[PDB]
Ligand binder design. Sequence first.
Ligand SMILES: *[C@@H]1O[C@H](CO[C@H]2O[C@@H](C)[C@@H](O)[C@@H](O)[C@@H]2O)[C@@H](O[C@@H]2O[C@H](CO)[C@@H](O[C@@H]3O[C@H](CO)[C@@H](O)[C@H](O)[C@@H]3O)[C@H](O)[C@H]2NC(C)=O)[C@H](O[C@H]2O[C@@H](C)[C@@H](O)[C@@H](O)[C@@H]2O)[C@H]1NC(C)=O
Ligand SMILES: *[C@@H]1O[C@H](CO[C@H]2O[C@@H](C)[C@@H](O)[C@@H](O)[C@@H]2O)[C@@H](O[C@@H]2O[C@H](CO)[C@@H](O[C@@H]3O[C@H](CO)[C@@H](O)[C@H](O)[C@@H]3O)[C@H](O)[C@H]2NC(C)=O)[C@H](O[C@H]2O[C@@H](C)[C@@H](O)[C@@H](O)[C@@H]2O)[C@H]1NC(C)=O
Ligand SMILES: *[C@@H]1O[C@H](CO[C@H]2O[C@@H](C)[C@@H](O)[C@@H](O)[C@@H]2O)[C@@H](O[C@@H]2O[C@H](CO)[C@@H](O[C@@H]3O[C@H](CO)[C@@H](O)[C@H](O)[C@@H]3O)[C@H](O)[C@H]2NC(C)=O)[C@H](O[C@H]2O[C@@H](C)[C@@H](O)[C@@H](O)[C@@H]2O)[C@H]1NC(C)=O
Ligand SMILES: *[C@@H]1O[C@H](CO[C@H]2O[C@@H](C)[C@@H](O)[C@@H](O)[C@@H]2O)[C@@H](O[C@@H]2O[C@H](CO)[C@@H](O[C@@H]3O[C@H](CO)[C@@H](O)[C@H](O)[C@@H]3O)[C@H](O)[C@H]2NC(C)=O)[C@H](O[C@H]2O[C@@H](C)[C@@H](O)[C@@H](O)[C@@H]2O)[C@H]1NC(C)=O
Lengths: 192, 192
Amino acid sequence: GELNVSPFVFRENVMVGEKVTATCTTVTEDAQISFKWFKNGKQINDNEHIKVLYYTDFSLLSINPVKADDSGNYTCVITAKEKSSKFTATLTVKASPEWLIQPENVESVMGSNISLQCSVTGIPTPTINWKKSETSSGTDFKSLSSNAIILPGGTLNLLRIIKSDEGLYECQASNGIGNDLRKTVTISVFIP
Amino acid sequence: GELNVSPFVFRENVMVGEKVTATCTTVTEDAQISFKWFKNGKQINDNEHIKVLYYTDFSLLSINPVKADDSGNYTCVITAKEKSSKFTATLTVKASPEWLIQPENVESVMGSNISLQCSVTGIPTPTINWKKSETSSGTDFKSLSSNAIILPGGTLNLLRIIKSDEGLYECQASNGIGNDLRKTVTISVFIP
Ligand SMILES: *[C@@H]1O[C@H](CO[C@H]2O[C@@H](C)[C@@H](O)[C@@H](O)[C@@H]2O)[C@@H](O[C@@H]2O[C@H](CO)[C@@H](O[C@@H]3O[C@H](CO)[C@@H](O)[C@H](O)[C@@H]3O)[C@H](O)[C@H]2NC(C)=O)[C@H](O[C@H]2O[C@@H](C)[C@@H](O)[C@@H](O)[C@@H]2O)[C@H]1NC(C)=O
Ligand SMILES: *[C@@H]1O[C@H](CO[C@H]2O[C@@H](C)[C@@H](O)[C@@H](O)[C@@H]2O)[C@@H](O[C@@H]2O[C@H](CO)[C@@H](O[C@@H]3O[C@H](CO)[C@@H](O)[C@H](O)[C@@H]3O)[C@H](O)[C@H]2NC(C)=O)[C@H](O[C@H]2O[C@@H](C)[C@@H](O)[C@@H](O)[C@@H]2O)[C@H]1NC(C)=O
Ligand SMILES: *[C@@H]1O[C@H](CO[C@H]2O[C@@H](C)[C@@H](O)[C@@H](O)[C@@H]2O)[C@@H](O[C@@H]2O[C@H](CO)[C@@H](O[C@@H]3O[C@H](CO)[C@@H](O)[C@H](O)[C@@H]3O)[C@H](O)[C@H]2NC(C)=O)[C@H](O[C@H]2O[C@@H](C)[C@@H](O)[C@@H](O)[C@@H]2O)[C@H]1NC(C)=O
Ligand SMILES: *[C@@H]1O[C@H](CO[C@H]2O[C@@H](C)[C@@H](O)[C@@H](O)[C@@H]2O)[C@@H](O[C@@H]2O[C@H](CO)[C@@H](O[C@@H]3O[C@H](CO)[C@@H](O)[C@H](O)[C@@H]3O)[C@H](O)[C@H]2NC(C)=O)[C@H](O[C@H]2O[C@@H](C)[C@@H](O)[C@@H](O)[C@@H]2O)[C@H]1NC(C)=O
C-alpha cells in the first residue's frame, strides 16, 4: 500500500543528434496517478524539442535531437491522491571532436619560435597529441621529445627552428567518442 | 544512416504481483518504423495481461500483474523500410517464500524416528534451517548439531527421540526476497 516510481535509466553512450526517451511508471499498478517531469529541479513542459507524453498509467519524456545542453538530472514525480514519489536519473550527452582551429602550413624564419594551433571541442574534452613525419614520403610518424613543447590546449610550440625542424606534422584529437580528428601540415624554414 | 534499437532494461528486483514495462525506440529519429515484440523468439500479441502499445516513434510492452511465468528474454524488432534491428533484455520474476507444508506440533513415542516438514516455494528457491528452543520459555533459539539431520528439502529428521528432544522447534524460510517465513512447533515424547 505504498507508492514507488519504477527506476528508469538512460543508455550509456548518448551522443549529440541522437534521440533520448524516458518512461515513468509505478512499481505496482495504482491507476490513480499523475505525472510531472523536472530537469535539475525545474519543471519540464511540453514544447521546445522536449516533448512530454501523458497517459493513464505511464508518462514519456522525449528529447530529440539531443544537444550538449540537455545534460543533467531528470526527475519524474508521481502523485496518487495522498502520496508523491520520485525517481531521478542523470543524462550525460557526449560528442566526438569537432574542429575549432585547424593547423596550417607555415613558412617561418630560422631561430624563430612558432605556434601550431590544433584546438577542438567535444565531450569529454578531447586529448591532442602531435607527431612528426621525420621522412618526407610522409608514411611514418613518431612522437616528439628538446625544443618541442605541447601546450595544454593542443598547441605545439617549436622553439628556435632550424632546417631539421622542417617536415610533416600531424595533430590528433580524440576523446574516445565517435571518430578522431586528424590533420597534417608542412613546416618550411628559410634564411632571411 | 543505420538502424539501432535503443537499449532497454528491466529493473533489478521485480516481484510477482508488480507491474513491468519496456520501451522500444530507435537511437536516432527515423520516423518510418514499425514494432514487434517477442518472448523467447515467439511473438507477443496484445491481450492476456500482456498489452503492447504501438505509437509513431515508440512502442510499449506492459505486463501487469507479473507472474513467475513471465520470466524470459523479451525482444523488440524495429523495421524501417529496408533494414530490421533488434534488442533483447532478460526479465527474471522473483517471489518471497510461500508456505507449502507448514510444520506441526507432534507427539510421538520414545525411540522413534520422526520427520518435521517445512517446505516452501519461491524464486530463488528458499533456504530452510531449523532451530531449537532448549528453554521452554521459548525466547532463545540455537542451531542443531547428533540425531538431527536436515534433509535438503527442509525436512528435519529426529532419530531415536528421547525426553531431551522435547522442546520448541522453529524452521526459517528465506531467499533474500520479501519477508522470511517462520513457524514454531512443539514436540512431545511419551512412553507407550
Ligand atoms: C545530480 O545528482 C547527483 C547525485 O544524485 C543525487 O543528488 C543528490 C543531491 C541527492 O538528491 C540524491 O538523493 C540524488 O540521488 C548530484 O551530485 C551530488 O550533489 C550534491 C549537491 O547538493 C552533493 O551533496 C553535497 O555534498 C557536500 C559534500 O559532502 C555536502 O557538504 C553538501 O551539504 C551537499 O550535501 C553530493 O555529494 C553529490 N553527489 C554526487 C555523487 O555527485 C548532482 O549535483 C552535483 O553534481 C556534482 C558532480 C557537482 O557538479 C555539484 O556541483 C552538483 O551540485 C546532481 N546534478 C544536478 C545538475 O542537479
Ligand atoms: C623562444 O622561447 C624561449 C623559451 O620558451 C618560451 O616560449 C615562448 C614562446 C614563451 O612562451 C616564453 O614564456 C617561454 O619561456 C624564450 O627564451 C626564454 O625567455 C624567458 C624570458 O623571456 C626565460 O625565462 C627566464 O629564465 C631565467 C633563467 O632561467 C629565470 O631566472 C627568469 O625567471 C626568466 O623568466 C627562459 O628561461 C628562456 N628560455 C630558456 C630555455 O631558458 C625565447 O625568448 C627570449 O630568450 C630569452 C633568453 C631572452 O633573450 C628574451 O629577451 C627573449 O625574448 C623565445 N623567443 C625567441 C628565442 O625569439
Ligand atoms: C536469453 O539470452 C541468454 C543470452 O542472451 C543471448 O542469447 C544468445 C543465444 C544470443 O542470441 C545472444 O545474442 C543474446 O544476447 C541465453 O543464454 C545463452 O543461451 C545460448 C543457447 O542458445 C548459449 O549458447 C550455446 O552455448 C553452447 C556452449 O558454448 C554452444 O555449444 C551452443 O552452440 C550455443 O551457442 C549461450 O552460451 C547462453 N549464454 C548465457 C550467458 O546464458 C538464454 O538461453 C539460455 O539460458 C541459459 C541460462 C540456459 O538455461 C540455456 O538452456 C538457455 O538456452 C536466453 N533465454 C531464452 C529463454 O531464450
Ligand atoms: C532411524 O534412523 C536410523 C538411521 O537413519 C536413517 O533415517 C531413516 C529415517 C531413513 O531415512 C534411513 O534410510 C536412514 O539410514 C535407522 O538405522 C539405519 O538403518 C540403515 C538400514 O536400515 C543402516 O544402513 C546400514 O548400515 C550398514 C552399516 O553401516 C551398512 O553397511 C549398510 O549399507 C546398511 O544400509 C544405517 O547404518 C542405520 N543407521 C546408522 C546410524 O547406522 C533406523 O532404522 C533401522 O535401524 C537399523 C540399524 C536396522 O535395525 C533396521 O532394521 C532399522 O529399520 C531408523 N528407524 C528406527 C531406529 O526405528
